[PDB]
A paper describes a structure:
Merbecoviruses from bats, pangolins, and hedgehogs pose significant zoonotic threats, with a limited understanding of receptor binding by their spike (S) proteins. Spike (S) protein is the major viral surface glycoprotein of MERS-CoV and forms homotrimers. For the MERS-CoV S-trimer, NTD is known to mediate cell adsorption by binding sialic acid, while RBD is known to bind the human dipeptidyl peptidase 4 (hDPP4) as the entry receptor. The S2 subunit mediates membrane fusion and exhibits a higher level of sequence conservation among CoVs.
In addition, S-trimer structures of six merbecoviruses from different animal species were determined. Different from previous MERS-CoV and MERSr-CoV PDF-2180 (31) S-trimer structures, densities that can be modeled as linoleic acids (LA) were identified in RBDs of most of the currently reported S-trimer structures, with CN-HedgehogCoV-locked-2 S-trimer being the only exception. Consequently, the identified fatty acid–bound 3-RBD “down” conformations for the merbecovirus S-trimers are also designated as locked conformations. In the characterized merbecovirus S-trimer structures, the putative LA carboxylate group interacts with a serine from a neighboring RBD via hydrogen bonds. In contrast, S-proteins of CN-HedgehogCoV, EU-HedgehogCoV, and SA-BatCoV are unlikely to bind sialic acid due to changes in key sialic acid–binding residues. Among our determined MERS-CoV S-protein structures, receptors for Japan-BatCoV, CN-HedgehogCoV, and EU-HedgehogCoV remain unidentified. The comparison of their RBD structures with MERS-CoV-RBD shows that the four conserved hydrophobic residues are either substituted with nonhydrophobic amino acids or displaced in position. To date, Japan-BatCoV (HKU5-HKU25 clade), CN-HedgehogCoV, and EU-HedgehogCoV (SA-BatCoV-HedgehogCoV clade) have not been shown to bind ACE2.
Author numbering:
A (entry chain C): 775 to 858, 866 to 895, 903 to 1112
B (entry chain B): 340 to 575, 586 to 680, 689 to 726, 735 to 774
C (entry chain C): 50 to 203, 211 to 289, 295 to 339
D (entry chain B): 1016 to 1201
E (entry chain A): 775 to 822
F (entry chain A): 1016 to 1064
Write the structure that this text describes.
């Protein structure tokens, strides 16, 4: 699994620090001009993420694809990668088996009226929608999957070919180093081994699989970042209360200045920590996006002639599946 | 913070719901007698008096009309708060002590008063009030100061190690009884308390003045705990952000008719962060609470046409009405969208593959140059289809023309 | 586990701080016995004074509907079903010895006497001073051994007055309970705001411990005893165990109806410390 | 940000040390200078952390720049996607204010025509079997048995010679030609 | 030389902040809840 | 750097909690221990980043 996109979050600094109280807002504009800088940095991060998403999906785009390649095979069963939405059955399996909560768009606020989904509208942050719908990403993935019929072959992406999957696999193994006699002798055992490998791959989404745990850990890390942002509004930071209203009710003006000042300092520290974490995750996402482009253009759009890349063993064929 | 801005789908500030009403409950709590402070004789510092008041109301204007405050020392509260806000319980420790020795009750003092007679506790909010009951008020009431007033200058065991007084505790009964038994002052004298010997000290004082004024010290400890705030001063809608005051707990939130949770005896239901997520009331009905949430607002602006549009992110447009008075003084053009419904946009079926104003999930905002944007989808350009032949021949798509394309990075 | 005061929760885990007892703490065991020959049969309970500390919690009953040993008859043919008895408790600040005989447990000055009066239907918390009564072979004589709150089988204050003098008596508070044969919890703490009592006969059918009867007692309680209790006639009764509260961290969980079902000692072993750490 | 953050009072009465020294007493001066010190040290720490993060980003981009120079510029790349879009032809380097500016020249096709092809050709009688290299064997438009060679990246039907075909081991999926053999098979 | 592994360090947050003083520990738990997040993040980096 | 920030007073009278508890009263102890806590938490957060 390659984590190519960070979670895009916009935080309203005024609402997060002061929660609408005018005395806090006066104290915060006396404190400094932090909120505009926070908003500008956190908007630049999201703009860079959108540009990285477009640059990633240009590489998945192919000039030609074969829509009937995955269904017109020999003894190979590639029903896990058929476009029937264009989301494949393995994409459905992967997205169903991961414990990911639904990000509400269109009606999230209404549902929150009547966790971390409903914590957005009470804390001050908002998780932005991704640049592409899951349906369009499924079209890109299906078009890439249909284009691996003859992409590895003598047509080096300038032209397209329409070999069936059996002939393409036969050419792959030969160039690997298996002689044609051996491949012609075994035209049923090889297909059976490939089919049972894909079956164990289908069944293998458990807690033992390392890549599925990587997907789950990425989702959990995003949830932990949002929970850390949301749970620091309950900290007193050395004050009598974590609420501005209780401070305004109980104390006089001179002491209210000190208590609101320490609350403001703690919440600005939380915002700065979140922004720096988003910057570090953005650099990690840029590296992983470059790796994703290299592995698509080396493993999926061709056959790798180099060892240790495109998995263990010696590479035959690769497929790509959208992740959360 | 600038006036020449660029294009982009920015994120604007949240707009918070206002108040649509007021709700009040009090459970009709009776006045608790604070006249016990001025009823009997004024207490000795060694034998000082403590009362705890719960489930009552008090009229502070009558109480402060009987005394003249010389100086009040409050920590974590103010006397304005104790005349306005409610709290869980009230503790009053009162004793007679003259103003000439009020520095002994100051924090950090090395006098015998703090370490043997009254050790104030500062873990909870407190106010130490030095007031004087005048002679005319003293005769109007039955308040007198005719006792023999003395404090404890020594409370020592047979070990010879002093026995200090812990914060927020009354005086040890052995040293208290030994000091109040002796009628004359003595710095060191033996005392056998019920089988154990004690060496004690007695030093006298006089709180009465020449005018007859009895000088008093009142230590007030308002306790702010979770749940109902049943000690209040005598002061004179479903689905909406409304102001409340259920049991002296004041704030704002959204009220719903809700299925009962928790124990009905404990009125307030809390979360893990000290937030009230519901309450039980009279007539057996339960309401679960939530703070009134805010609409997230995004602004779409284009520099070339100087036209701005406003995206309300992930909101259903029905709900805009209820909070329609919380936005700016200009906010209609109603239109549902997959990234949250938006104002200022016309729905079009046009598709453009490359757009500079992305609204989210495969959505764009086409520039006007009308005076408004156009809602256009992202275009997925279909690749050229190549058909698989089921024979020994196979289809190829070979280029016939080309151009030298320049990419730069 | 003492319930949080003034509030409730539902399906939440909270790390509460307060007065909690240790895990696997074998508390002190006390049993009451029936009359042996027509005279009270009691134990060493009256002459031993324990330490109040930060407060105590009592597992009340918890052994009913089992086969019980009459203390005067160890033969298993005489064994019968245990009944439920409520203890008589005595809390004070200064403890010495009665003058005439030199027997411990005198309990000078004011003291809180918790008595289960009537046929186990009212619990009485009366706060005043016990002085010896100059009577023959009684408290304040040469032929005194111990005092018994002797009762019949279907007000112990009259027996207490038969063994002590009731003077300077500040309040006498009565609380209504039902006669049952069940597990119950009873707990007493003391703070600046007074003496707080806890019981399990509040709300619906749980082992939790809710506050009631905030008594106006502000002098520090330092000692407690269990006043021996006997019932005139074979019979068998349950036991109660007393555990001491400590200032420790303690992680609990609630349910749907707002009752604590399970808790964590937070310091019993390394695993509970790690559970509190995360 | 580094320059403008010095103007923040950070909760003090002023953002200048001299005004605080002029107005307040020594005990208050300690508090105000302490909160200004805390704010400015926080600013310096934030700048140093930003510098470290951009340093790791620059290390990654320097590795990428080395790889792209040694692949795109000193040689001609055969791995698609890397060295730009399309199939790489030639690349140049241009200095930039904070890095390097690459210009990749790529072969981008415009038109496409569908064609039928064969894995190879065999002669019934001699079982000699040839396969095309760097191209395909496409059918002729005026005969059902005439085969021509075409390039992979461009379309032009050419006669089959020895220089654009290789001799390979026979396969069952090759076309078994009978008449009008090409000169390598003739 | 390629730096392929970091120095794995575990820090006890409560001991480092307060050095075993009970008053400091009360003030720290009144301050907020930071030590659990520090331990979780600093254990996650070691696991990775 | 992690070890050397336990000797910083951060504006308090001392870098040791015991000296603060020995010298000052309770209300000043809260302030001094709070600023020491803030400094040490800042050091821990810098180390984790
Ligand atoms: C707290 O206690 C004070 C008493 O010290 C209350 O003040 C009293 O308020 C009543 C009602 O307003 C006053 O009665 C009025 O008297 C005039 C004639 O003087 C009469 O014309 C009116 O119809 C009314 O009966 C009373 O004079 C006044 N006394 C003083 C000394 O101020 C105060 O109202 C109490 N606070 C609350 C919230 O109840
Ligand atoms: C000794 O036996 C008696 C009688 O069997 C036990 O009293 C019974 O205790 C159970 C506790 O589970 C009570 O059940 C409760 O019933 C209510 C509905 O009334 C239900 O909502 C609760 O969840 C719970 O199941 C039962 O009512 C009660 N019997 C009577 C007559 O009150 C006693 O617990 C036994 N003692 C020991 C130590 O085993
Ligand atoms: N007259 C009389 N009074 C009694 O109290 C009495 N008690 C018993 C039996 N009492 C008991 C008490 C504890 C355990 C016991 O084994 N305790 C468990 C507790 C397990 C847990 O903590 O959940 C243990 O093994 O520790 C057994 C019998 C029998 N006859 C009696 N007879
Ligand atoms: C300390 O003050 C209390 C309160 O006045 C005294 O308690 C009173 O004692 C007298 C005489 O025994 C009783 O008549 C009153 O009813 C008691 N009142 C209350 C409220 O308890 C107590 O005696 C004083 N202590 C000493 C040693 O003199
Ligand atoms: C005669 C007193 C002044 C001279 C002191 C000389 C040396 C003692 C040095 C330090 C002890 C000072 C404590 C004084 C306490 C007074 C404040 C109070 O607790 O009320
Ligand atoms: C291919 O695999 C899918 C999923 O394992 C299965 O449902 C289907 O029956 C298989 N088809 C064949 C022909 O084996
Ligand atoms: C906007 O137009 C498209 C195409 O005409 C249509 O599918 C969609 O339902 C329209 N939006 C709404 C809210 O009706
Ligand atoms: C109790 O809380 C848990 C949270 O882990 C939840 O799954 C469960 O549904 C809750 N019970 C009820 C009755 O709501
Ligand atoms: C009985 O109590 C006395 C207290 O006077 C004590 O000394 C003795 O050890 C006790 N004996 C037993 C067996 O508990
Ligand atoms: C009690 O003790 C005293 C002194 O120790 C002694 O004189 C007296 O006789 C004792 N009383 C009895 C009953 O033993
Ligand atoms: C305790 O009792 C003794 C004698 O019984 C008495 O002198 C003393 O005053 C009492 N103490 C209190 C605080 O009442
Ligand atoms: C028990 O009842 C008998 C008969 O009424 C009575 O004489 C005796 O005093 C009673 N004893 C007690 C302890 O109640
Ligand atoms: C307690 O019960 C008695 C019956 O013995 C009754 O007379 C009394 O009114 C009850 N008190 C309360 C407060 O319910
Ligand atoms: C105890 O019961 C016996 C048996 O009837 C009786 O003789 C005796 O008087 C009773 N004693 C008391 C004090 O009730
Ligand atoms: C191109 O495709 C069409 C439709 O499938 C087919 O009739 C035609 O023969 C193809 N061209 C060649 C050269 O085979
Ligand atoms: C070509 O001839 C071979 C026999 O040498 C045969 O196995 C193969 O099927 C033939 N392929 C055709 C007819 O294209």
């Amino acid at each position: 699994f390659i984590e190519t996109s960070i979670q895009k979050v916009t935080v309203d600094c005024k609402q997060y620090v002061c929660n609408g109280f005018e005395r806090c807002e006066q104290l915060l504009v006396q404190y400094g001009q932090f909120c505009s800088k926070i908003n500008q940095a956190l908007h630049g991060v999201n703009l860079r993420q959108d540009d990285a998403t477009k640059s990633l999906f240009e590489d998945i785009k192919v000039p030609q694809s074969v829509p009937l390649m995955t269904s017109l095979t020999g003894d190979y069963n590639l029903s896990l990668f058929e476009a029937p939405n264009y989301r494949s059955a393995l994409e459905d399996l992967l997205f169903d088996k991961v414990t990911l909560s639904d990000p509400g768009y269109m009606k999230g606020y209404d549902e929150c009226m009547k966790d971390l989904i409903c914590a957005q509208y009470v804390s001050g942050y908002k998780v932005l929608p991704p640049l592409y719908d899951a349906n369009m990403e499924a079209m890109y993935t299906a078009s890439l999957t249909g284009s691996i019929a003859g992409s590895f072959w003598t047509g080096g992406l300038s032209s397209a070919a329409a070999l069936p999957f059996a002939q393409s696999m036969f050419y792959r193994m030969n160039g690997i180093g298996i002689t044609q006699n051996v491949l012609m002798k075994n035209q049923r055992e090889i297909a059976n081994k490939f089919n049972q490998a894909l079956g164990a791959m289908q069944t293998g989404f458990t807690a033992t699989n390392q890549a599925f745990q990587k997907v789950q850990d990425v989702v959990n890390a995003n949830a932990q970042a949002l929970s850390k942002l949301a749970s620091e509004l309950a900290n007193t930071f050395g004050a009598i209360s974590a609420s501005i209203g209780d401070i305004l009710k109980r104390l006089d003006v001179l002491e209210q200045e000190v208590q609101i000042d320490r609350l403001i300092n703690g919440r600005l520290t939380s915002l700065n920590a979140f922004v720096s974490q988003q910057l570090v995750r953005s650099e990690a996402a840029a590296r992983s996006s470059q790796l994703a482009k290299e592995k698509i253009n080396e493993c999926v759009k061709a056959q790798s002639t180099r060892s240790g890349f495109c998995g263990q063993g010696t590479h035959i064929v690769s497929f790509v599946i959208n992740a959360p | 913070g600038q006036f020449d801005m660029d294009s982009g789908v920015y994120s604007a500030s949240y707009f918070n719901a206002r108040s649509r009403g007021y709700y009040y409950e009090a459970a009709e709590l009776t006045e608790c007698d604070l006249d016990v402070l001025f009823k009997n004789d004024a207490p000795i510092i060694a034998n000082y008096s403590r009362r705890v008041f719960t489930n009552c109301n008090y009229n502070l204007t009558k109480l402060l009309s009987l005394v003249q405050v010389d100086e009040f020392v409050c920590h974590k509260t103010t006397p304005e708060a104790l005349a306005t806000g409610c709290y869980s319980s009230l503790t009053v420790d009162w004793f007679a002590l003259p103003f000439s020795m009020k520095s002994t009750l100051a924090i950090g003092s090395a006098e015998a008063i703090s370490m043997f007679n009254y050790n104030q506790d500062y873990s909870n909010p407190t106010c130490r009030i030095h007031a004087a009951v005048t002679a005319n008020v003293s005769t109007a009431l039955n308040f007198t100061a005719n006792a023999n007033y003395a404090y404890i200058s020594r409370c020592q065991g047979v070990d010879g190690k002093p026995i200090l007084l812990q914060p927020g505790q009354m005086t040890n009964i052995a040293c208290r009884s030994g000091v109040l038994a002796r009628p004359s002052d003595a710095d060191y004298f033996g005392y056998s308390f019920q089988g154990r010997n004690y060496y004690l000290g007695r030093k006298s004082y006089k709180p009465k003045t020449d005018e007859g004024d009895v000088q008093m010290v009142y230590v007030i400890t308002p306790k702010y705990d979770k749940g109902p705030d049943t000690v209040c001063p005598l002061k004179d809608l479903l689905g909406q952000c409304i102001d409340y005051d259920i049991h002296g707990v004041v704030g704002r939130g959204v009220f719903q008719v809700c299925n009962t949770t928790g124990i009905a005896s404990q009125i307030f239901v809390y979360d893990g962060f000290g937030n009230i997520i519901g309450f039980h009331s009279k007539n057996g009905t339960y309401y679960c609470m939530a703070p009134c949430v805010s609409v997230p607002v995004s602004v779409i602006y284009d520099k070339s046409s100087d036209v701005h549009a406003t995206l309300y992110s992930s909101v259903e447009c029905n709900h805009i009405k209820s909070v329609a008075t919380v936005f700016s003084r200009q906010t209609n053009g109603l239109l549902q969208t997959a990234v949250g419904c938006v104002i200022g946009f016309r729905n079009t079926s046009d598709t453009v593959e490359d757009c500079t104003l992305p609204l989210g999930q495969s959505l764009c905002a086409k520039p006007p140059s009308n005076n408004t944007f156009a809602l256009v989808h992202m275009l997925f350009q279909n690749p050229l289809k190549v058909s698989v032949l089921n024979s020994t021949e196979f289809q190829v798509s070979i280029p016939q023309n080309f151009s030298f394309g320049i990419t730069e990075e | 586990v003492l319930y949080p005061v003034g509030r409730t929760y539902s399906n939440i885990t909270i790390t509460l701080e307060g007065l909690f007892p240790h895990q696997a703490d074998r508390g002190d065991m006390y049993v009451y016995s029936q009359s042996h020959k027509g005279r009270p049969f009691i134990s060493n309970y009256s002459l031993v004074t324990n330490d109040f500390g930060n407060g105590i919690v009592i597992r009340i009953g918890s052994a009913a509907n089992k086969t019980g040993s009459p203390i005067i008859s160890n033969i298993a043919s005489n064994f019968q079903i245990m009944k439920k008895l409520y203890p008589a408790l005595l809390f004070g600040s200064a403890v010495g010895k009665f003058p005439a005989n030199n027997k411990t447990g005198a309990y000078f000055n004011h003291s809180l006497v918790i008595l289960p009066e009537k046929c186990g239907t009212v619990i009485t918390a009366l706060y005043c001073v016990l002085e010896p009564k100059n009577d023959t072979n009684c408290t304040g004589s040469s032929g005194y051994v111990s005092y018994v709150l002797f009762e019949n089988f279907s007000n112990l204050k009259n027996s207490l007055q038969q063994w002590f003098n009731i003077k300077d008596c500040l309040f006498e508070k009565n609380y209504n309970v039902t006669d049952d044969e069940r597990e119950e919890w009873f707990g007493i703490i003391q703070d600046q705001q007074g003496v707080h009592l806890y019981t399990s006969r509040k709300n619906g059918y749980s082992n939790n411990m809710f506050l009631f009867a905030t008594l106006p007692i502000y002098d520090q309680i330092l000692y407690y005893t269990v006043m021996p209790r006997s019932i005139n006639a074979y019979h068998a009764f349950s036991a109660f165990y007393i555990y001491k509260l400590h200032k420790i961290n303690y992680m609990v969980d609630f349910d749907v109806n707002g009752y604590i079902t399970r808790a964590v000692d937070c310091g019993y072993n390394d695993y509970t410390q790690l559970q509190c750490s995360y | 940000k580094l320059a403008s953050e010095l103007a923040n009072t950070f909760g003090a009465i002023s953002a200048s040390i001299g005004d605080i020294l002029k107005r307040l007493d020594v005990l208050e001066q300690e508090v105000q200078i302490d909160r200004l010190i805390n704010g400015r040290l926080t600013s310096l720490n934030a700048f140093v952390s930003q510098q470290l993060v951009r340093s790791e980003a620059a290390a990654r981009s320097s590795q990428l720049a080395k790889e792209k120079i040694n692949e795109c510029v000193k040689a001609q790349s055969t791995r698609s996607g890397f060295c730009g879009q399309g199939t790489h032809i030639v690349s140049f380097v241009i200095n930039a204010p904070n890095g390097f500016y690459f210009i990749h020249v790529g072969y981008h096709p415009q038109d496409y025509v569908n064609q039928t092809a064969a894995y190879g050709l065999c002669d019934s009688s001699s079982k000699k079997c040839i396969a095309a290299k760097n191209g395909y064997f496409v059918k002729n438009d005026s005969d059902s048995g005439s085969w021509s060679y075409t390039g992979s990246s461009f379309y032009q039907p050419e006669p089959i010679t020895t220089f654009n075909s290789r001799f390979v081991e026979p396969e069952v999926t090759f076309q078994n030609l009978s008449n009008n053999l090409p000169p390598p098979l003739l």
